[model samples]
Target: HMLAADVPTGCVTIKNRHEGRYLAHSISTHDADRRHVSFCTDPQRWTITAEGTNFRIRNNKHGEELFESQQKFNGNYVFLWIKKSLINDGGASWKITESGNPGYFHIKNVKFSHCLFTQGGTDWVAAYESCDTAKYEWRIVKC
Candidate 1:
């Protein structure tokens, strides 16, 4: 399971006792910008954690600096990002449990779609296919 909270700051940890392998994902923002983040696993195992407002992967042995989405005064637009590296590596399937907002974390059974790939590999074709198939597809609707 996943646990999260919203405040000026917070922390997350996955203990070894519950560590037969599990998936962990989170999306967080503080004071309008992201902050230095850490993800660790005990000795003798591979533990990975990625932090970003958009979907991507960023893992580090010590803590890594996450990109700041905005300055302190400016309002921040928090977005969703996820890391399935652990599960993709060799881990158990799990879900996220949001502690602050309704949509902080969303979990789903991952799936691959073949029917959505009608238009071979053009940029627009790939965009349309992804939008039509991905659960949380994003697009530039307005400027």
Candidate 2:
């Protein structure tokens, strides 16, 4: 589930809040997902909605659901990859907490305690640390 009580909805842009890089993805070369960063120069908007108590994060451009990925040791993993959303929700649900520098929230998983994180790569992953760390924090506002 997204998060109980005040899960938000509608279209918005999600940025690293630290680097000002937009959460964007793409289909490249042989159809691999290239989720990458930029300062809203090529803004990738997301259309978010409440699913159960949580939210389903998806790309507004290509219309694919965000999936939390594993196995970071392997190199060049895309920042994001979209698969069809499972009806059971699987790793696709997220909870938001007002954390880090305030008014901003770190989006974490309901199944796992890991928060959304990245390495300045095009994609993102999760880890046990949340807002306490710098990269895992996020902020959502109007597109």
Candidate 3:
């Protein structure tokens, strides 16, 4: 029951519209796994490729797609350095909807209704809650 936007492939900065913080990842060559999506004052550039209704979100530096680290089931944390492509298994693919902002948008899992979000001020990105709240709001601007 949402309108999907035709996401353009290019460099983008995903930011929290409410908190006014950008999702930044620590750039590490030796330890790429250590680099997780977190909030920062600076905008961390990300590359996105759209295929049909699904999209692949990757880091500009490593070119690694956001990995949904799993220990149990659906509610898993999404991090970098996993795969270059987005998987259709579970809820790996995402769809973006405009947040009524020019460059901002909302990302939600295809299988689940949960939108991409970080817990308050942490680097942990998860799609646990299914809501269009403040934390669910994002600015996907071309960088």
Question: How close is every model to the real structure, measured as TM-score?
Answer: 0.17, 0.70, 0.74
The global Cα lDDT (0 to 1) of model 1 is: 0.22
Q: In model 1, where do residues sit more than 4 Å from their true spots?
A: 5-19, 22-53, 62-143
Query: What digit string (tens of lDDT, one per residue) describes model 2 on residues 1-143?
Result: 44333434688778776556777764432135434322354567888888766887777877766655543444222234434435353466778767736546688766555677766544444445434765777767755
Tens-digit per-residue lDDT, 23-61, candidate 3: 766543224343456667877888888857777687786
State each model's CA lDDT, in order: 0.22, 0.59, 0.66
Backbone clashes in model 3: 0
TM-score of 2: 0.70
lDDT of 3 at 6: 55
Candidate 2, pairs of clashing residues: 1-54, 2-53, 2-54, 2-55, 3-54, 35-122, 36-122, 79-122, 79-123, 79-124
Candidate 1 residue-wise lDDT, 14-100, digit = tens: 211112211122233332323222222332112323222212222223233222122222222121123212234111221222322
Better-scoring candidate (TM-score), 1 or 2: 2
Clashing pairs in 3: none
Question: What ordering of candidates by TM-score runs from best to worst?
Answer: 3, 2, 1
User: Model 2 residue 85 lDDT?
Assistant: 38
* Deviation of model 1 at 26, angstroms: 22
Q: Clashing residue pairs in candidate 1, if any?
A: none
